[PDB]
Amino acid sequence: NYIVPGEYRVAEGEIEINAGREKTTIRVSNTGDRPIQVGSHIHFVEVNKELLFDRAEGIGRRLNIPSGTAARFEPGEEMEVELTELGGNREVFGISDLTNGSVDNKELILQRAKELGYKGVE
Amino acid sequence: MKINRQQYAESYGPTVGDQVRLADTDLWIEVEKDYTTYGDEANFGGGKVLREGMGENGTYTRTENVLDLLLTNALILDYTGIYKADIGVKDGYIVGIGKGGNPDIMDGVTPNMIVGTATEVIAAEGKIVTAGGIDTHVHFINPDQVDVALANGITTLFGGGTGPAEGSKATTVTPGPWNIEKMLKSTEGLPINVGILGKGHGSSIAPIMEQIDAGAAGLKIHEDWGATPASIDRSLTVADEADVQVAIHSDTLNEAGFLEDTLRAINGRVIHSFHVEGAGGGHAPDIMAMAGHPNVLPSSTNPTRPFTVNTIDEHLDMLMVCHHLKQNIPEDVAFADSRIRPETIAAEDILHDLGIISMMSTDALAMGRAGEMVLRTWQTADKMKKQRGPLAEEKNGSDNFRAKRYVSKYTINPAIAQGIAHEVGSIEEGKFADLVLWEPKFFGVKADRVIKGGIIAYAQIGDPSASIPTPQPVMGRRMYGTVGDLIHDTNITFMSKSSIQQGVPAKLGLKRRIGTVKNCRNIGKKDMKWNDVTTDIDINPETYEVKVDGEVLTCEPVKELPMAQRYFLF
Amino acid sequence: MKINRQQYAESYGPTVGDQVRLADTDLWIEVEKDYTTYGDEANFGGGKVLREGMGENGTYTRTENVLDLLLTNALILDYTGIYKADIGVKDGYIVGIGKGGNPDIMDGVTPNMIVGTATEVIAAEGKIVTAGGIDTHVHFINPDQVDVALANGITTLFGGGTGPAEGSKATTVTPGPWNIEKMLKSTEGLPINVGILGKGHGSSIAPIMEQIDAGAAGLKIHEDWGATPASIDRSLTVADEADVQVAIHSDTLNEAGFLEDTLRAINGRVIHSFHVEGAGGGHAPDIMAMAGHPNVLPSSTNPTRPFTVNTIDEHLDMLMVCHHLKQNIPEDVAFADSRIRPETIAAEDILHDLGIISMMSTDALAMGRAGEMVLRTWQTADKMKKQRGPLAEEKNGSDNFRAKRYVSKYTINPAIAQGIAHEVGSIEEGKFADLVLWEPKFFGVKADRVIKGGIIAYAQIGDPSASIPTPQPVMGRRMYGTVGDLIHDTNITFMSKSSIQQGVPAKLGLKRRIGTVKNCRNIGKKDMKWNDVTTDIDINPETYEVKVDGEVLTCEPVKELPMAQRYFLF
Amino acid sequence: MHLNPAEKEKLQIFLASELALKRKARGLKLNYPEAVAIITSFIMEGARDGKTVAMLMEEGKHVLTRDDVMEGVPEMIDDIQAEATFPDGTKLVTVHNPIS
Amino acid sequence: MHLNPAEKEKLQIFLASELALKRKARGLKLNYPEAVAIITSFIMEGARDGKTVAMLMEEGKHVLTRDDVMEGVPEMIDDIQAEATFPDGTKLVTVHNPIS
Amino acid sequence: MHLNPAEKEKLQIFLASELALKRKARGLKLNYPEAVAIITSFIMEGARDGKTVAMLMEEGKHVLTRDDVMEGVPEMIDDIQAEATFPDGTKLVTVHNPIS
Numbered sequence A: 001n002y003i004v005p006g007e008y009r010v011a012e013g014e015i016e017i018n019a020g021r022e023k024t025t026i027r028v029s030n031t032g033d034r035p036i037q038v039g040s041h042i043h044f045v046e047v048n049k050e051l052l053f054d055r056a057e058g059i060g061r062r063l064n065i066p067s068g069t070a071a072r073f074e075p076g077e078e079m080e081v082e083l084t085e086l087g088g089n090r091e092v093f094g095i096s097d098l099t100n101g102s103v104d105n106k107e108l109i110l111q112r113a114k115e116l117g118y119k120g121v122e
Numbered sequence B, C: 001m002k003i004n005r006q007q008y009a010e011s012y013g014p015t016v017g018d019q020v021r022l023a024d025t026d027l028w029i030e031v032e033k034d035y036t037t038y039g040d041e042a043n044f045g046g047g048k049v050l051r052e053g054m055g056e057n058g059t060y061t062r063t064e065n066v067l068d069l070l071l072t073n074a075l076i077l078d079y080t081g082i083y084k085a086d087i088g089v090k091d092g093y094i095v096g097i098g099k100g101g102n103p104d105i106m107d108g109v110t111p112n113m114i115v116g117t118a119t120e121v122i123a124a125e126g127k128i129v130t131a132g133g134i135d136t137h138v139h140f141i142n143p144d145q146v147d148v149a150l151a152n153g154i155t156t157l158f159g160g161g162t163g164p165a166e167g168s169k170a171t172t173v174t175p176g177p178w179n180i181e182k183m184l185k186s187t188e189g190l191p192i193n194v195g196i197l198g199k200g201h202g203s204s205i206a207p208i209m210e211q212i213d214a215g216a217a218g219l220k221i222h223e224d225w226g227a228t229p230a231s232i233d234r235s236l237t238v239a240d241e242a243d244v245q246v247a248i249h250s251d252t253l254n255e256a257g258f259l260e261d262t263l264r265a266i267n268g269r270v271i272h273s274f275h276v277e278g279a280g281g282g283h284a285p286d287i288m289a290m291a292g293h294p295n296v297l298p299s300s301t302n303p304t305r306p307f308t309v310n311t312i313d314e315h316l317d318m319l320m321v322c323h324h325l326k327q328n329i330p331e332d333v334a335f336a337d338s339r340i341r342p343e344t345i346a347a348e349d350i351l352h353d354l355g356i357i358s359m360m361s362t363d364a365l366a367m368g369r370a371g372e373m374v375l376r377t378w379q380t381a382d383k384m385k386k387q388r389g390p391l392a393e394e395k396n397g398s399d400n401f402r403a404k405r406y407v408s409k410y411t412i413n414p415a416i417a418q419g420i421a422h423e424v425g426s427i428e429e430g431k432f433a434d435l436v437l438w439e440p441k442f443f444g445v446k447a448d449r450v451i452k453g454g455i456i457a458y459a460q461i462g463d464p465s466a467s468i469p470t471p472q473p474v475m476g477r478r479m480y481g482t483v484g485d486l487i488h489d490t491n492i493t494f495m496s497k498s499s500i501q502q503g504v505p506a507k508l509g510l511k512r513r514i515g516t517v518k519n520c521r522n523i524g525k526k527d528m529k530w531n532d533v534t535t536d537i538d539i540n541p542e543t544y545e546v547k548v549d550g551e552v553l554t555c556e557p558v559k560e561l562p563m564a565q566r567y568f569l570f
Numbered sequence D, E, F: 001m002h003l004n005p006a007e008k009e010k011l012q013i014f015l016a017s018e019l020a021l022k023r024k025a026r027g028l029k030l031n032y033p034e035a036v037a038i039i040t041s042f043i044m045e046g047a048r049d050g051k052t053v054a055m056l057m058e059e060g061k062h063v064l065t066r067d068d069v070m071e072g073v074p075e076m077i078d079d080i081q082a083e084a085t086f087p088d089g090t091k092l093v094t095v096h097n098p099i100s
C-alpha cells in the first residue's frame, strides 16, 4: 500500500509479436567501415548496399523485432537476424526504389538490386 | 519473439488487462480491449516505424484516407469505454479510432487512418486521453479564468457574464441583445469553446426570445433576477420553441413558492437544475429533491465536492460575507443555517455515486472554482470507493464502472444537456477533436497537452529558450492553436438555430467555427450516460435528513484528499 | 575648428579608422569609411540640427524624396562592409544608405534621404547596426520562443512545427496542406518573419508537391520520417520545379545508405545540409564531409558552438535522455559514441573560421537554443581569434575580415540559401527594414532595439510608469510594431510562388506582407558570402579525425567564454 | 514543476510578504498592500502546514496589530480572503477585520 | 538589467525554491513542485558558481532524500532538467532520479 | 493588495536583488544584471524608508565597489535610475557611476 502516483499493475503473460507469420533466419554482414542500424519495419532487401546477405531472403520481409527497435551492425560485424513477413497488401514503395509495387516481383527486385550494387544478389 | 508485459507497457502503453492508477487516488482503470496488431504498433522517432515506405505511406495524397494527425497508443477513458487505440484526426475532427499506419505493409490498419506525408504525430503511449471537459456553469467574470480552465482539461465553457459586474458576479447571464453581441465578439479572442446564456426572466415572450435570436445558446433562470413562476414558464416556453436548454437556480427563499410550485411551473418540461444539492442556491432545504425527476438534468457545482472537514466552515463564511450577512442578525443566521447543510452535502456524495446526480460543473468565480471540475470529480469518486467500496457492478478488481460513471459527469452529460453532444463531449468518430492528454501521475490534476480542433492549444512545457522543451520551468502555457487567426478554427462558438439562420455571425463578423445548439427539448434523465437514475428523494424539513427508497443517506466528511498537497504549490 | 577624435566619437559615434570592441570579446571592428560631411552630421534634440529650416526640410511632401525614418550616425556591420552612414527608410524598406538631412543648407546629402515633416528619427550614434538574423532551423514548438529570438536580434524564422507534438519536437516540419494552413493562420499573430517547411518525404510527387501549393516555403527531409533515397529524390524533384529550398537531416543510422549514397540520391542538386557537423544528426560519423561539396549549403546548429569543456557531457546526456537511450544497452552506448564526437566538433570550429561552413542556425527547442545563434557565432569567432590568431587577410590590427565572414553566417547566407535575400538578410538599399541596434557593450548578447518593417518591434526599455523610459526594470518588451494590425505590415510571411499564384493568402485571409521564395535552385557554395570554400573533407572512420587538404584539424575546447557570465542572470 | 496559473500568481504574494517583513524588521510601520500581503501569505502557509480553516480564521486576526501599521490601515482593511490547498483540497479563508 | 525572457522566467524558480526551503525548515515533508524547485535552483546556482555539468549531475542526486519528501514524490520525479549560464555559456544539466 | 502594473514589475527587481545578495554572500564577484539589481533595490527601499532624493544620490555610489564585481562591470554601468514612492510621492533617482 505505498502509493506510486500513476503506477501500472500490468497483467500476467507476455505478448507475442508478429504472431502467425513465417519466420526466417539469415546471416548478414556489414562489409562497410561505418556502423549500420536497421529498423523494425524497413523492407529488408532495401537496406544499405554494403550489408552482404542473400538479398532474395529479404524480399517481402522485415526484422522480427519489436516495433520501433533496430538491429545494429558495427563495421565488419557479421551476425544472424530473424525476419518476419510483411503484412497488409505486401507492397512496398519508395525507400530504395527496388520494389515500387508488389513484393511478389522477385526477379524484378533482384535485377534492380544487382544493377545498383546491393550486395548478395545471388 | 515475446515481450514481457512490463516492458510492453513501458514502451507502448498498457494493453488488455493491465491496470493504471489514477494519479494518487485508490482508483484503477483497466484496459478493456486494444485495437493494435502486436508487432505493428505505431510510434515515431529515429529508426522508428512511422517513416516513408514503412509505417508511413508515401503514395497517397491527403484526400486519399490520410490523416492530418495521429495520436499513437492512447489509453482512452470515455463513457464509451476504457481501451487502447490510435486516434486519427482530420479537418479538426476525430475521423478514426483504431489502428493507424500503412496498409502497404501492416496488418489491421483502419482504412481511413493512413499515416501519410500530410500526417503530424502525437505520441500518446503512456498517457490517458479523455474528451475535453464541458463546463456548463461558468460566470464570465475575469478572462484569466480561461487558462485556469484549460490547465485542468476543460475545453467548453457555457455560461454568461459581462465581466465583473454584479449581475455577472451573481448569475450566469449575459442580458439582452446588445450585451450578448458584445460577448460574442469578445469570445473571438478566448481560446476555448463558448456558449452564452441569456436572462431567463420576463413576463412577456419577446424580451426573452430576442436574446435567443441575438445569439444566446440558452437561458439561465436565477433567483437574483426573480425565479418566479412566470419567469420559469416564459423561459421554458421560449426554450421549447428555440430548441435550447434552460438552467435554473431556484427561489431559495421560497418567496413565491416551494419546490413543488417550481416543479408545477416547469410542468414536465426539460430543465437543467444547477447546484442541485443547494449550497450554491435553491429552495431551502429540499431543492436536492429535483434530482429524482425524469425531466430534470441535475448538476452539482464543485465547492461541495467532495464533503470534507473544512467544507462547512468555508461555505458558511463564504455565504455570510458575499451576502453581507451580519452575525448578530438572527434572520441572517437562520438563512445561512437553512442553506448550508451537512446532511445534503454528505448525501450529494452518495447521489453522485449512485448515478442520481448526472453532471458536475464549476460555478466559476461565483461560488466555484474554474480549474477544479475535473479534479473534484475524481476526488469524489475516490472518497466513495474508500467509504462505500467497489460498486457491485465492478469486475477484475478494477474501477472501470465507477470511472465511466464519473468521467461522464463532466464530458458527455453536460454536452447532452446543453444540446451540443453532436460536436463535443466524447471521443467518438465524427466529433470535434478536443482531446486532453494526461500523464497518469497527474491525471485529473494538471493536463499535459490540450488539443483543440486538432491543434495543441495549451501545454505544460518548459523553458522556451532551452535546447529542448523539458527544462525548467515547466508551466502551463498557450500554444500555437491560440495564436493569430488559428484561434478561430480551433474553437467553436455555440449559438441558437435562429441566430444562425438570421446571419448573426456575419452580422457581427464572427470568424470562429459556429456550432449549432439542438435536440435539448426531447431528452430527460434517462439520456444521461451511466447516470440515469430517477427515484423519490425525500428531504426531512425538520432534520434535513435525506432518504431515497426509504433508506437514509448519511456519510462522513474526510480530513484528507488525494490530488491535493502532493501536487500544488499553494 | 577641429574636434579631437575621442570627443568626436563620443558625440557622433566612431569615424574612419576608429575601432570598437565587440562586447567583452577580443574582437575589434574598424570603421572603413564614413558617408558624413564633417560639420553637417545629423542629430536630433533641443537645439540640434534636425529642425525645420535647418537639417530638416520644411518644403517637401513625403513623396518628394523625404524619408519616413532616418537612423542617424549608424555603425553598420554587414557582409557588404563595416562603415559609418545614416540609414533612410520609407514604406518599410531601406531606400538610402548615405547622408541624411536638408539639401537647402547641407553639403553631401543623399538625394532621397531628405529629413522632412514626415520623418521620424532614431539616433544610432554609438550603436552598431546589423541586419536582423535569419534563423533557418526553427522548430515551432512554443510561441514564447519568438520573444527569445527577437531579444538576440533574430527577425526571420524558417522552420516547421505545429506546437509540441512529437513530430514537431523532433523535426522542422509542418506536414500537409491542412497543418500548413493552420500554421499560416497562426503566423498572423507572431511578431517575426516566418517561412514554413513541409514534410520532404514521400515516394510519389503529389503528396509532397501539394504542401508547396498549400503555402510551404520549402521542405525538410528528416531521418525520423525516413531520410531514404526515395524521399531525398522526390523532394529535390519537387524543389527544382517549385523553386524552394530543401533542408536535410540525413540517415544517421546509415540504414539505407552511407553518406555517398545520400549524395548520389541528391545527384548534384542544390540542398541545405542542416547541423552539418552531425551532433545534431546525420550519417555517422562522416556527415560533416557534406560541407566540401559545391552543391551543398552547409549550416551548423548552435549547441556545438563553440567547442567547450562542458560541450560533450551536456550533449551525451541530452542525447541519451531524449532518445530514451539506456546506459546498460551497449547498442545505445555505441550509437551515442558514434554520434557525439570531440573530433568533429573541434573541427567544426575551424571549418567556420575557414569559411567552409557557411551558416549558423538555432535548432530551436529540438537540440538548440532560440536566442543564441548570434551569441554563439561571435563566441566562436572570438575563440578562433584566440587560438588561431588574426586571419591572414586582416589589416590595421582589426578583425574586420573575420567580422564579415561571421556576420554573414546568420544574416545574408541563410537568406540566400532559402531564396529570400531579395527581401532580407543585409543592410542594402531596396531591402526590408529589419534592423537591429546594439550597444557595443551588449553586442551579440542583448539587442537594444529591433526594427521590423521600419517600426520598432522589440526593445530593452524600462518602467512604463516612469517619467522617462530608462528607469528599472529594463527588460525586453514588445513595442507598437507588434500591436493590433500593425503586426501585419511589419512582418513577412514567405511562401512558394505557386501558393501565391493560387491565391492562398486570400483564401486563408492572411493580412501579413507576402514574400515570395525564389532563386534557390541555381545557387551553390560559391554564392555564400565570405564562406565559399569547397574542398575534400576526410573523416577517418576509425579515429574520426578530420582532414582537409591532407592537414589534420584538431582544436582544444575552452573553459570560459565571453558574452556569458558577465551578462546573464541565470 | 507543472505550475498552473494560480500557482504562478500566488508566488507574488509570498514575494510581497517577504518584502514587507523585511521592511517591518527595519522598523517601518507597514502600509496597506504590505499588511495585506503579510496576512495573505500567513494564511496560505498555514494551509500548507495543515491547519484548519477555523484555526486560520482565528489566527489571522493576530498577525499584525495597529501599532504595526500606518494610521488608517486598520480601517482600510475590512477583510482578507485567500484560497490555498489544505490537506483536504482548495478552500477559502476569510479573515474579518484582521487588524483591530 | 536588460532581462531577456528566460531571465524573467527563471527568477520564478529561485523564488519557488526559497518558498520550499522555508517550508522544509519548518518541518514539512516537501511535495512534488517544491522538490523540483529546490533541485532546479540548486543546479542553476551551481552553474553560477562555476561548477561543471558533471559535478552538478552528481551533486543533484544528493540535494533531497526520500525522507525530505512526501510518499510517492521520489517516484514521480524521473529527472530534472535545467539550463544555466556556465563560465563557458549556456549548458543543459539533466539529473536522473534525483531522489532515490 | 490592489497591485498596479509597476508594483508588479518592481517586485522582480527586489527578487533579483535578493538573488544577487545571496551570490555575493557566497563569495562571487557580481555580474552586470546582479549589480544593477542590488543598487536599484537599495534605492527603492531607501525611498520607502523616507530618505531624500539627495541622500540616495549620494548613498547609491557606495553600495558596491569594484572589488564586489567582475572586470568591466563598473565601466558598463554609467548610471542607474529608479522611481519609487517617497513620503512626498513618486520621484526619480539617478545614480551616476555607481561603482567607481
Ligand SMILES: *c1cc(O)ccc1O
Residues within 6 Å of the ligand: B169, B170, B318, B321, B322, B323, B366
Ligand atoms: C465578494 C464578491 C463576491 O462576488 C462574492 C462574495 C464576496 O465576499
Ligand SMILES: *c1cc(O)ccc1O
Residues within 6 Å of the ligand: B350, B387, B388, B554, B555, B556, B557
Ligand atoms: C459515506 C457514505 C457511505 O455510503 C458509507 C460511509 C460514508 O462515510
Ligand SMILES: *c1cc(O)ccc1O
Residues within 6 Å of the ligand: B468, B469, B470, C169, C170, C318, C321, C322, C323, C366
Ligand atoms: C525531452 C523532450 C525532447 O523533445 C527531447 C529530449 C527530452 O529529454
Ligand SMILES: *c1cc(O)ccc1O
Residues within 6 Å of the ligand: C350, C387, C388, C554, C555, C556, C557
Ligand atoms: C584550435 C584550432 C587551431 O587551429 C589551433 C589551436 C586550437 O585550439
Ligand code: NI
Residues within 6 Å of the ligand: B249, B274, B275, B280, B281
Ligand atoms: Ni446559482
Ligand code: NI
Residues within 6 Å of the ligand: B137, B139, B170, B171, B172, B363, B366, B367
Ligand atoms: Ni452560478
Ligand code: NI
Residues within 6 Å of the ligand: C249, C274, C275, C280, C281
Ligand atoms: Ni536535425
Ligand code: NI
Residues within 6 Å of the ligand: C137, C139, C170, C171, C172, C363, C366, C367
Ligand atoms: Ni532540428
Ligand SMILES: [O-]
Residues within 6 Å of the ligand: B249, B274, B275, B280, B281, B363, B366, B367
Ligand atoms: O450559482
Ligand SMILES: [O-]
Residues within 6 Å of the ligand: C249, C274, C275, C280, C281, C363, C366, C367
Ligand atoms: O535538428
